[PDB]
Ligand binder design. Structure first.
Ligand SMILES: [Zn+2]
Length: 399
């Protein structure tokens, strides 16, 4: 298996070199329709990269040809970089789907004095989800002098003290010129090693997309998602929850569906077995009508009888965010009131929630759409402040 082994979050303002850096790492330079593979509940995108090492000079890179001496490099490990369109999307992705991230690269521009508001929230989110496999990329060093670079470095050290990023390496880089990229890649190997996963645990996949690949104007329905536990294998019998909607006595219910895995695609190739890391394509025997147009997006996949429960309503222990990004009042966040209709994101699932009850640092919400989740799972909570959805906190599913 040559598929991605870890998902690495590209956490940084959408303009501190973050894009230039991601492309430098993935080697993708052609103007990118994987934009059609991105999530539509949480807008997470994946971009694989193969970490390789040069036998001649020993330096690491993500190219088959060493950028430093021109010799052929040796394969080390494939990884996948995950990102989202803009600050709000990224924050929601981290709070709702921490299990999709194994480490992160915090991009900080040395070109800028004090730690920016977005950067402050980025670290706030990493702290909340307990993601400690962090690497700090001090980008754009080619735009500032030697002294301001060292000053920025000091500010960063003070910024990370006492946080999940305290022990993270700070790597001065120039994504544009390619300076110190080899140091960053090796750091990915040293600080974001592949976790020691128990491949025997019950499989679980969070479905991001679903389609009818039948070429028209035949193949079973196809699912696209992330394996967060165990492994999947061609021929396995799988169950999908909540499942297909159906009406019963003027009410909408969901029937879990069981099917069989016909094929698996990961790392750009068909495989007989897939694991956590990167996007995984799942060919099934399902009637294509059931997966067409992302009907299964947000669903959870596992083996029959071994999936998390389905909830029609949730009791959430709520933690409101003390945000720093937004207009003057958008930061005040008024307490949650009964009858409010909130936007909830859990895993890759997305549903509106009507607040029907309140408790101490707790709310009870009736869901528009049932969700498949485990007690203890984290749920991002958003409020429609005007005409847009703004993240205001997160909840922990209570039993
Ligand atoms: Zn070399």
């Amino acid at each position: 298996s040559r598929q991605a082994e870890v998902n690495i979050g590209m956490v940084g303002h959408v303009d501190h070199g973050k894009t230039t850096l991601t492309k430098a790492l993935t080697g993708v330079w052609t103007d990118h329709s994987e934009e059609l593979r991105r999530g539509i509940t949480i807008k997470i995108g994946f971009a694989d990269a193969e970490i390789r090492r040069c036998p001649n000079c020993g330096r690491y890179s993500t190219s088959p040809v060493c950028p430093y001496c021109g010799h052929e490099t040796e394969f080390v490990r494939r990884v996948s970089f995950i990102d989202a369109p803009g600050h709000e999307a990224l924050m929601t992705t981290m709070l709702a789907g921490a299990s999709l991230m194994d480490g992160a690269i915090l991009v900080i521009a040395a070109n800028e004095p004090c730690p920016r508001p977005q950067t402050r929230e980025h670290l706030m989110a990493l702290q909340i989800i307990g993601q400690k496999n962090i690497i700090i990329a001090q980008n754009k060093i080619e735009l500032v002098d030697k002294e301001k670079a060292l000053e920025n470095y000091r500010q960063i050290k003070e910024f990370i003290e006492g946080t999940v990023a305290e022990n993270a390496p700070i790597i001065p880089i120039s994504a544009l010129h390619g300076a110190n990229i080899d140091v960053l890649v090796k750091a990915i190997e040293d600080f974001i090693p592949t976790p020691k996963r128990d491949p025997n645990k019950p499989p679980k996949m969070l479905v991001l997309r679903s389609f009818d690949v039948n070429k028209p104007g035949l193949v079973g329905g196809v699912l696209g998602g992330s394996i967060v536990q165990g492994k999947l294998k061609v021929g396995d019998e799988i169950e999908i929850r909540p499942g297909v909607p159906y009406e019963e006595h003027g009410r909408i219910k969901y029937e879990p569906i069981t099917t069989e895995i016909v094929s698996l695609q990961a790392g750009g190739q068909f495989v007989e077995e897939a694991y956590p890391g990167g996007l995984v394509g799942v060919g099934t025997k399902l009637d294509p009508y059931l997966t067409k147009g992302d009907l299964m997006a947000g669903n959870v996949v596992g083996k029959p009888g071994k999936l998390p429960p389905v909830w029609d309503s949730l009791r959430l222990e709520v933690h409101l965010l003390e945000r720093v990004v937004g207009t003057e009042q958008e930061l005040k966040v008024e307490p949650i009131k009964r009858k409010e209709v909130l936007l909830l994101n859990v895993g890759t699932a997305r549903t509106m929630g009507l607040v029907t009850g309140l408790g101490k640092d707790e709310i009870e919400v009736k869901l528009q759409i049932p969700v498949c989740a485990e007690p203890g799972d984290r749920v991002a909570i958003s409020r429609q402040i005007g005409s847009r959805w703004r993240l205001i906190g997160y909840g922990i599913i209570k039993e």
